[PDB]
């Protein structure tokens, strides 16, 4: 029971959360302070998350609205988060807005019980050949949420 127009709103929602999570700050929270400092672990350079996302619990509270609980476990693992001096840290990285999700198109791939998956064809600002991104939606609590962290971007 999830439409195409609604799914893009959720997918564009995960896009927002993923970027901000990876940047270390929810831009809406203007009262935040971002700890200076870099370190090396696992051959990765790490940086400190801003105050609003400073603890894993604050991170988990940020995302449980759009991402299933399992997506958040795997995400904290996949993107190699770590805690130093009591503050969460991320490996330094950059984002890419090449995919224009706002002008995407969604085609329903599956609907079986509590799980729904849609295929998105995304135009590129680049003029590049457009991209196939499959997003799976699973209903946690009663809310439809995305079941993988990096689904959008």
């Amino acid at each position: 029971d999830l439409s195409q127009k609604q799914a893009l709103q959720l997918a564009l929602s995960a896009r927002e959360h993923f970027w901000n999570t990876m940047s270390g700050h929810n831009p809406k929270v203007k009262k935040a302070v971002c700890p200076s400092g870099t370190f090396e672990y696992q051959n990765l350079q790490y940086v400190y998350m801003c105050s609003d996302l400073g603890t894993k619990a604050k991170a988990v509270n940020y995302l449980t609205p759009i991402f299933t609980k399992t997506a958040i476990e795997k995400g904290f693992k996949d993107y190699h988060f770590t805690v130093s001096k009591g503050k969460l840290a991320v490996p330094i990285g950059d984002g890419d807005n090449l995919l224009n999700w706002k002008k995407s198109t969604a085609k329903l791939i599956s609907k079986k019980g509590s799980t729904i998956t849609y295929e998105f064809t995304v135009p590129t600002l680049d003029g590049s050949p457009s991209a196939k991104r499959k997003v799976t939606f699973v209903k946690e609590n009663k809310k439809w949420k995305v079941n993988q962290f990096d689904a959008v971007i």
Binding site: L44, G93, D94, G95, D96, L98, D126, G127, S128
Partner: protein
């Protein structure tokens, strides 16, 4: 200071690897890591953001092969980068993957910020 023959060839082989934030591995890269991965094949270098590589690299006006080119995509300032591979082309790591793109494309060219060299 580097074998440009090795840099451009070492990069080109990786075409088709996908995209991941902070990706320093052959299983997924970003602007910063793709250059980091290709660079550490020859010499030991530290991991930084596209903004860091902009500020830790020596200034030039016109790219030669092996130089680094910078673009403004998602934010003001350097937010995406690649290597100049000749012609008017550059190899970079983007959402759809590692790609070859030319500097006379309508997205990149207005947003070509400048070039900085190792």
């Amino acid at each position: 200071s580097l074998n440009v023959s090795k840099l451009v060839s070492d990069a080109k082989a990786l075409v088709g690897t996908p995209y991941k934030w902070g990706g320093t591995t052959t299983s997924g890269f970003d602007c910063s890591g793709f250059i980091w991965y290709v660079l550490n094949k020859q010499t030991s270098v530290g991991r930084t953001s596209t903004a860091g590589y902009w500020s830790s690299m020596k200034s030039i006006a016109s790219p030669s092969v092996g130089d680094f080119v910078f673009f403004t995509t998602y934010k003001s300032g350097p937010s995406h980068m690649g290597i100049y591979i000749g012609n008017n082309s550059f190899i970079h790591a983007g959402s759809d993957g590692v790609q070859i793109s030319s500097l006379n494309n309508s997205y990149w060219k207005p947003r070509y910020l400048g070039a900085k060299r190792f």
